[PDB]
Design a protein around this nucleic acid. Structure first.
Ligand SMILES: [Mg+2]
Lengths: 367, 165, 378, 251
RNA sequence: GUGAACCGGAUUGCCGUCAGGAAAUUAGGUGCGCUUAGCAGUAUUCCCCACGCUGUGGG
């Protein structure tokens, strides 16, 4: 089955994701300009959050020699590490993503041994290839490509491909984009002749209401982590909690946009469906209602249209709608689109775990 | 187009008290205050009766408030992208020109209900440079159909043509 | 009886391959080829590849051919990949012990396991013409022309534009057959069609024709070219050369221009009904008659009319989208819709869900309206 | 007879098909540049899919190595001007700015099926052909190319389908010669469907068809016109109506 | 059934860490909205029906 998460979140004036020129990212949707938050930024923010540290068992880095050196008290294991990695094929250095305990222990024991360089490189390559046991690796996948131009011809590589179990789309605004520019002037503590007219700076910021979409495949997540099952449930719960209560760390020391989502919808399906087309027409604010209410109403209308459209009696779908203390209902007028409207995040996590299987959150917090 | 010319003529016929009434209503909607609603209805409703292509209520209200605040003299051929663009040739290219250009260009991402303050700052920039004439009818015609791409293209092209001289 | 038949070839994309395509680089010709047109006719009539070579291709080879380039397309290239994630077939086979048997004798012993495959990805680049239109005139016997037109009216098989991913944008049998003496007159008879009111239009239309031998002998001129597009077979393909000349026709004197005859931009419907149209006054008077000149809220004498919905404006107005109201209630309703974006459906005074609001607004008027301001109209 | 299917589908910002340089595929039409999705992507997207796996079928519809396939898929084209965009990304180290291309567009898709070829390829069977047509309709309605989907989860569904039974093949690309310009009182999909409606409002003036929109969200014809023989708000009901017209089979 | 048919450019990635537009300004000087009128001592009170050569009853 497939777990589908949809979120509506309004943010204060801030700059979370910025381009090379230092401006908030934008895109074109429905023929109009919308604000954009990239998918990799969200994935990185969720990965390095406090609600996911119990499952952060992977490292993506190019400085593997330093990590191997740190697994030694006084032995000199730096130049030999670089030579072994160079014969491996990592000759700019290639980024390597794999588990921490495996690389530390196995690289320390193999590298410090008195063996041939080719054999040590082959064993290191095998260890790197077989180190794919971590929730983040299973969620985000992996693609390692050794450089055949400057690698030892004697060594041979094995399969190093991990198919991802998570799909994240770029966050887009439900309305038109309104970029803004703030002008700043730095002051001097000690008086004196001072500068001329002053060096006026420029900082670009914007505020928008974003729609977020996440998709998780349970079968692929289980297959990635081998026959283990409780770990998958723990990963799903921790991912839901982290996505609920984590924001990117952009200019947060000057733009403390720590806002929380106002509406979440979790559905259990067999095929992926995206509700982005609910915002092809931009949302316009009138004297009544606010941005979030209109966005949720449009989302509910599109969900009702989709449910009353592509519908098969042989595979009905169900989901839960969560709003803080039931403040933003989905079916504002009459429709009961959701089945088990929940007013607490922990209750929603418990319901999701219960539907996935006979899982209690307390029990699964041990793997 | 007939309907806007008579509207601007009626606006130009107002006296100090009505101008002050409209001035004190800046930043407000048409419904909350009754004297402004009555004055706008008296000025506008017969025109809508006689002419079907009369300007909509929102655009007329915005133009009335702007005219009450600034009180420019009507003259054909003195549109905003020409005076702004002839002014922009006297600023420092490195610093001041981008700052003015961004404020002039921000108008393309706002609807008719959010085009009061940017137009206010643009007209203040105009007033700072001793400008006494403006084309109100043309501005109203542009604002009526602001949701069409050729209108914005012509606006920007006129700005560039005035600036490159 | 007509002696020539016309074909229109138009679409978003089309391709007519040339002789310079023997590898993964497939290029296209500037004009539709004779072989492609004959194959299209054969597909329309319903003859297979092995049957066309027998007394169906020689008959169509005798027809004279001419193409008029109405508008030429832009050359575009597409990057094509084959067999990614699968295995491609190879042609390698084990050599026989003796040269006595080969071909059909060895083909009878072929087994599914004897074939060999390899995991790879084939790369290619293919050429197309974008936004191009062509007119083809085929001249010959009248019975054959009638048969071809009848077959083209209803095709047996699907017909495309050189490649199966190129469906036509206009009917192929748009122009009925006629009688003409030369190819030039036939090509000048059909007019030239525009697509919208303001678009560039070619001043001169090129044309590519077959070269008539004239009298016996008459060696080909110095501007004649050789095109390898005379079909002899389709399985395996076999083509023969032919002589081709090029001419031109200047529009406005021999080729006419047709009108738009259509609407391009859709645009929404019409709001903004007129308050001076006689029909509006008639329906307003009728509605006031139906309501007994009584307001629908306070039951006071009624003087104005409120539009519940704006489905129709001006031309048509049923007396069912209108309600009778007095001055105060109409003003309250007007001030209750200033910035709500109701568009089509407006306030219905009969709905109780509005009542508590409307009266409230009325109170404000009775507290603040000045009769000396409505009088002395400014 | 020939069954023609026209689809209008809007996609979120994504990259479903790119060339050797990594940019989305494009084409030229109406004097402008338009986004393009290749035919051999939609095919092999509908094919080899798990949903479509529902006298060997899947070869009669789409042949392999003189099979004479009965399915024709055209190139997906955009109804407006192409708007490519560049995303700037960097890679962290937790212990060099790159650029990628992406775009968003609304696509018009055209499919054709030859009923007689399908029947002949199945060796006279007529119920199996109808089942194959229904399965193909369901698969095409609910399948998208598997491009950069892990980074661009673009799983949108079509907003309008039209099924026609014309005597000769013809595509309605000429309804999009003028690129669609978005106005405040409408949206892109509505304007595209209106442009399509004002191409069958003509032609007939100067056959039958079935129109499908999700829960009658977008009705064909911006009036009370009879340009569509039947308007259906459910995909299964559309399949049933087509099945009935094919000669009266039950889905 | 067309240099045609069978035909995916695919897999991996935070732009994060830095900033007072600030110092000084009266919008002042002059002006009648004025000349006019019973809600009442009548000579047809806008329409309809019935009884008489004005009296009842309905709008
Ligand atoms: Mg009333």
């Amino acid at each position: 089955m497939l777990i589908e998460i949809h979120m509506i979140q309004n943010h204060s004036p801030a700059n979370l994701n910025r381009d090379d020129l230092g401006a908030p990212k934008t895109c074109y949707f429905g023929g109009v300009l919308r604000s954009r938050i990239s998918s990799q930024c969200i994935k990185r923010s969720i990965r390095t959050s406090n609600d996911f540290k119990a499952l952060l068992g992977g490292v993506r880095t190019r400085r593997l020699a330093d990590l191997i050196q740190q697994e030694a008290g006084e032995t000199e294991c730096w130049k030999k590490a670089q030579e072994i990695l160079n014969k491996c094929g990592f000759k700019t250095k290639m980024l390597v993503f794999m588990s921490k305990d495996k690389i530390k222990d196995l690289a320390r024991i193999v590298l410090d041994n008195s063996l041939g360089l080719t054999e040590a490189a082959q064993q290191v390559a095998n260890v790197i290839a077989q180190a794919t046991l971590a929730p983040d690796i299973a969620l985000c996948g992996r693609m390692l490509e050794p450089n055949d131009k400057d690698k030892d011809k004697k060594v041979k590589w094995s399969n190093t491909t991990v198919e991802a179990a998570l799909q994240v789309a770029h966050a887009i605004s439900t309305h038109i984009a309104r970029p803004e520019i703030d002008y700043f002037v730095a002051a001097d503590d000690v008086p004196g002749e001072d500068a001329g007219a002053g060096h006026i700076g420029e900082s670009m910021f914007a505020s928008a209401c974003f729609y977020k979409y996440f998709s998780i495949d349970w079968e692929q997540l289980v297959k990635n982590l081998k026959g283990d099952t409780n770990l998958a449930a723990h990963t799903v719960g921790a991912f839901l909690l982290a996505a609920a209560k984590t924001n990117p760390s952009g200019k947060q020391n000057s733009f403390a946009a720590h806002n929380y989502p106002d509406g979440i919808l979790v559905e259990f399906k067999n095929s992926p469906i995206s509700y982005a087309n609910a915002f092809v027409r931009p949302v316009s604010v009138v004297k009544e209602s606010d941005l979030v209410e209109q966005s949720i109403g449009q989302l509910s209308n599109y969900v009702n249209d989709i449910r009353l459209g592509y519908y098969d009696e042989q595979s009905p779908v169900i989901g839960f709608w969560f709003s803080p203390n039931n403040r933003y209902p989905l079916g504002y007028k009459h429709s009961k689109l959701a089945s088990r409207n929940i007013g607490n995040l922990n209750e929603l996590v418990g319901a999701v775990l219960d539907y996935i299987g006979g899982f209690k959150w307390e029990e699964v917090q041990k793997s | 187009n007939r309907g806007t010319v008579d509207f601007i003529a009626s606006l130009e016929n107002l006296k100090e008290g009505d101008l002050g009434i409209l001035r004190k209503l800046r930043g407000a909607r048409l419904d909350e205050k009754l004297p402004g609603f009555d004055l706008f209805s008296a000025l506008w409703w017969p025109l809508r009766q006689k002419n079907q292509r009369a300007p909509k209520r929102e655009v007329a209200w915005l133009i009335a408030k702007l005219f009450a605040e600034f009180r420019f003299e009507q003259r054909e051929g003195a549109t905003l992208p020409i005076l702004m663009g002839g002014i922009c040739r006297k600023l420092e290219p490195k610093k001041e020109l981008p700052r003015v250009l961004a404020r002039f260009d921000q108008l393309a991402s706002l609807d008719i209900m959010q085009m009061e303050e940017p137009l206010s700052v643009i007209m203040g920039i105009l007033r700072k440079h001793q400008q006494v004439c403006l084309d109100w009818v043309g501005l109203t015609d542009v604002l009526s159909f602001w949701e069409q791409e050729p209108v914005k293209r012509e606006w920007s092209d006129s700005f560039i043509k005035a600036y490159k001289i | 009886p007509p002696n020539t038949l016309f074909l229109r070839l138009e679409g978003a994309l089309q391709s007519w391959g040339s002789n310079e395509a023997k590898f993964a680089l497939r290029r296209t010709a500037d004009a539709p080829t004779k072989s492609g047109v004959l194959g299209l006719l054969c597909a329309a009539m319903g003859i297979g590849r092995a049957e066309a070579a027998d007394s169906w291709l020689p008959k169509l080879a005798n027809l004279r051919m001419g193409v008029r380039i109405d508008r030429p397309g832009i050359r575009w290239w597409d990057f094509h990949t084959v067999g990614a994630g699968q295995r491609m077939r190879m042609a390698e086979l084990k050599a026989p012990k003796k040269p006595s048997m080969v071909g059909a004798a060895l083909a009878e012993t072929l087994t599914p396991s004897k074939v060999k495959t390899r995991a790879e990805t084939l790369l290619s680049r293919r050429e197309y013409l974008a936004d191009a239109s062509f007119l083809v005139a085929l001249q010959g016997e009248p019975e054959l022309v009638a048969k071809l037109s009848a077959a083209l009216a209803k095709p047996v098989w699907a017909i495309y534009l050189g490649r199966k991913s190129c469906p036509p944008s206009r009917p192929v049998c748009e122009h009925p057959p006629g009688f003409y003496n030369t190819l030039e007159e036939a090509l000048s008879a059909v007019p030239l069609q525009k697509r919208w009111h303001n678009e560039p239009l070619p001043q001169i239309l090129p044309c590519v024709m077959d070269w008539i031998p004239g009298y016996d002998g008459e060696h080909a001129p110095d501007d004649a070219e050789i095109h390898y597009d005379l079909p002899v077979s389709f399985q395996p393909p076999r083509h023969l050369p032919r002589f081709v000349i090029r001419r031109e026709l200047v529009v406005g004197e021999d080729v006419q221009v047709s009108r738009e005859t259509g609407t391009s931009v859709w645009r929404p419907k019409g709001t903004r009904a007129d308050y001076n149209n006689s029909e509006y006054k008639k329906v307003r008077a009728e509605r006031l008659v139906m309501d007994h000149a009584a307001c629908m809220v306070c039951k006071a004498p009624a003087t104005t009319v409120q539009h519940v919905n704006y489905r129709r404006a001006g031309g048509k107005e049923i007396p069912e989208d209108l309600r009778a109201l007095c001055r105060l209630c109409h003003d309250a309703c007007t001030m209750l819709e200033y910035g709500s974006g109701m568009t089509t459906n407006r306030i219905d005074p009969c709905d109780p869900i509005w009542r508590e609001r409307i009266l409230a607004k009325r109170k404000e008027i009775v507290e603040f309206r000045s009769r000396g301001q409505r009088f002395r109209k400014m």
